[PDB]
Amino acid sequence: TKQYEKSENDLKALQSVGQIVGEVLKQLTEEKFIVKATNGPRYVVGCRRQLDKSKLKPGTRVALDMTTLTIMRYLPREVDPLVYN
Amino acid sequence: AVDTAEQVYISSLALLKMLKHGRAGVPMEVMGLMLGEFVDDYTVRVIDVFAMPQSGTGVSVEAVDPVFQAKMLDMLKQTGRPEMVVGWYHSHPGFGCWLSGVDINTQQSFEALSERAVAVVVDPIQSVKGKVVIDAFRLINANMMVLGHEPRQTTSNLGHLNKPSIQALIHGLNRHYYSITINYRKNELEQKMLLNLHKKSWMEGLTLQDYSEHCKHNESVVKEMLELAKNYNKAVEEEDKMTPEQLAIKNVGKQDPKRHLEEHVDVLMTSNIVQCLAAMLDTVVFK
Amino acid sequence: MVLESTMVCVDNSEYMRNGDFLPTRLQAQQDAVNIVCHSKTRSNPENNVGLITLANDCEVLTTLTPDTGRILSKLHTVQPKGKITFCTGIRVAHLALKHRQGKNHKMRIIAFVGSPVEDNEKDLVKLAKRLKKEKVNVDIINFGEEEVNTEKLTAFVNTLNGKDGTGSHLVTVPPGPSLADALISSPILAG
Amino acid sequence: TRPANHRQLTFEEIAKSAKITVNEVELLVMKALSVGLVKGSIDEVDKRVHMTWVQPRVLDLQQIKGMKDRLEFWCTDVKSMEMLVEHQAHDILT
Amino acid sequence: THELQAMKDKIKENSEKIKVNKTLPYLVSNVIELLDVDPNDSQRKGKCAVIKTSTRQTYFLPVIGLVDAEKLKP
Amino acid sequence: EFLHAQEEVKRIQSIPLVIGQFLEAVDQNTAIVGSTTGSNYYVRILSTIDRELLKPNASVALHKHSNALV
Amino acid sequence: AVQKVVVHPLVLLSVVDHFNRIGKVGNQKRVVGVLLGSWQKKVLDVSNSFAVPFDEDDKDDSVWFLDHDYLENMYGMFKKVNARERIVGWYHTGPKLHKNDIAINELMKRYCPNSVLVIIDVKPKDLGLPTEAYISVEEVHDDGTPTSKTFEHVTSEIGAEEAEEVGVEHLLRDIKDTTVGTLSQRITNQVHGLKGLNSKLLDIRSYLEKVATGKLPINHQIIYQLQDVFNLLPDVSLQEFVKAFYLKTNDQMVVVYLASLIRSVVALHNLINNKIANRDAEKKEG
């Protein structure tokens, strides 16, 4: 009964939409960083306030917001085929 | 039957719940409901605005929850003023806030139940500060195809509402729909205090703190930005002394000026902050 | 049916913890809450009944509601230790009666006094004329040990209302061993 | 106690009051620096002692009065001077 | 002790919202999976996941939502 | 009020602004540009800068909503 | 705990418009409602709220009650539509809290671990940024009395995000904006200065009035230490404060030197170019 509500409260976190993957290409200023979507449009957005650009660097796999498209979270390395070979 | 120029009297609390319910759903479009009272045909007022919960069916006529309406109106009955419902509204944060096919699919239901049921749309994106933004919509009666489609009389608020003419795709809805005017009623005391509430940004937080925080820093570490300003002095004015000689070569103005004007005059206005607030030290230190 | 909102007041005074009423006054007044909540349930469905602790600090843990389930939960482990306080016990339920959403319900209070009170006659007559101005009708049922043939409480109910006002009735515990159900058997049939 | 500051003292003041030798006034004043009642520094050329800040202890209605004097003077100071500032520029605003 | 049925009612009402918002499977997709948590630079917790689409796109999302890392590698 | 209007046009617009693939300037105050999604456009350019930095070939940041030449 | 709170204009109006709700029917007492807060970090933020009907007897000035069903299902309403919103406390319009306001927080401590109560003001008068913030905390005392709750003041600031900026920034339509550098800083020199004069004036008027009338305590406790903190710095020269004088004079050197430099540059460009285009337009047309 309580664990079911925990999965309900789990679902209370899931209405938040997932962000968009991104690759930081390069940067311009502290509010402007060259980034491109996987489908090819290039953007310049602002970051979140926790990060330093030493945590980003140019040519970095990252994520952006779904509206403001702001730099928020990230992971350096991913791919499908590797481990499955 | 009888049609006359319409005016929507809005309360600041209504507009607040409008943009608040629309900002929390961005990008996703949300669905609210308009609350108020119908005084007559040519005037209408919205005295309250409440938000409907978001469901899986999305924005649809079925998204309105009847047990939510029964319990809300009951919660409005224990609230001071339990006014009757009037119309619906839905935000459109992601685009130019035009009515879709589902918006009219719920409009024949809201015009069925309620006589008027004015549809309002609001978006945060268009302007960050100085525009009403929002939107207005009302469904014209398709049963009026017999008679003419062009009222009203006292065209004052009408001809002034049409302008800008609102693009094309929006006024593409001017066929089968028409907008409605919105004015802000006072309620001047609350409008004045809430005016100063946002004025706390550019004036000061308490009207005391933030420029006493300008007495905290007060040239501190504000000369560092004066060193960067005097670096803007050297930078901008070393290419500003190249301008008047070139003006003598090309004979004369290339229109132009480079602008490359004003600027550090504002730095000297911070020097007025220097002289004033430091002259306060004679008052601070002595007694 | 009759329109009104009944506010039941349990007696949390330290003198109410004895088992003179079988098996114990805790369960005795619990059955008293059982019979008043079920009678008002059989009376009108629109009647909402909360509880209030009279002794020590007065706090209503259960907001006024027609469902007595949460009231029955607060009847257990209530910890009724403290000195009886009267003058505030009626007015605290009067403020809970002014929070009613519907104004068509008449203000009604039922309270249990099982302890001798230090309330002066000037305080109860000031509350009597105050309830005369506020029209509130209070039906009190005296339990426990107190002054033999309670007077200041009987004069409180007398001077509380008049003409008719049909009315405020006071039921005092008889000087003899009896079950709590026999004490509440008279008020449930006729007030 | 002094209106001061004028927060710089001398070795003669501490050594005469505390009636301790000039070598132990170091341990004296610097231990008070470790207590936290004063952050000051000691000038050992003339053997002077430069106090900084202070530790508030107690202080009286006569002090609330003179406090209103030190305040109201700050009141008429800022009032006068600031009312003179915008007295000049009140015209050009409109 | 009788609030277990009330919690059963709130998990029936919210799972009714899980019946309307599952959120429904419609568009076909494919996955990319990873584990993450954010120290700063205060400390917070969470996890992320990646996804494919039928439109070829890819997204960076806090961990699913609804079913969990239980299964599978993408 | 014109200084306030200058604060408007300098605030306008974005932050964040999508840069796009520029081809040529066709005539006064307008030009043609592809986006980073590769579609040629026709837009009246930002008023205060007509030419000097626009150049025949560059990458111009296009308005969020309109894709305006800025 | 709670350091500072961010009060948006939306929650303030949400109390004041309810002051119109029960204000048209009157009469006495105050507008009390449940505060919906948003806690991202130690700094507290406020977005929405809702008000509940409340009455308080004077008899019995310590009697208070709220509707929990209204707090329950409406929280179920607002949490449903917005999952980020939750109740951080309650609020009232004051203007000055009576001693009974403590137990309201003690009742809703079951809802939230720490409930911050926000006093507000429906009619702006004095002295500055309206409302107030008090956090529920047990400070005991230095006198070792049995633990009692004296609410600590939380500094309140007004802010917004995006859409709440859009509404009010268009709604001002009153005074020039800002304008930066000319009228802004000097009017703030009037307000922060003069409102700082009458602040401590009336506050020092309360310092002496409380000693004259209202004893006990009253005085003690903090009186002797706080007043000595006022006596910390008089603070005048000699000596180093004299050095700061002409050093500050040496600081104004550079900026006013630069001022004369801008004067020469602005006068050079504008005067030369204007006289050129002037004499040319006259000699060519005439």
Ligand SMILES: [Zn+2]
């Ligand atoms: Zn829609």
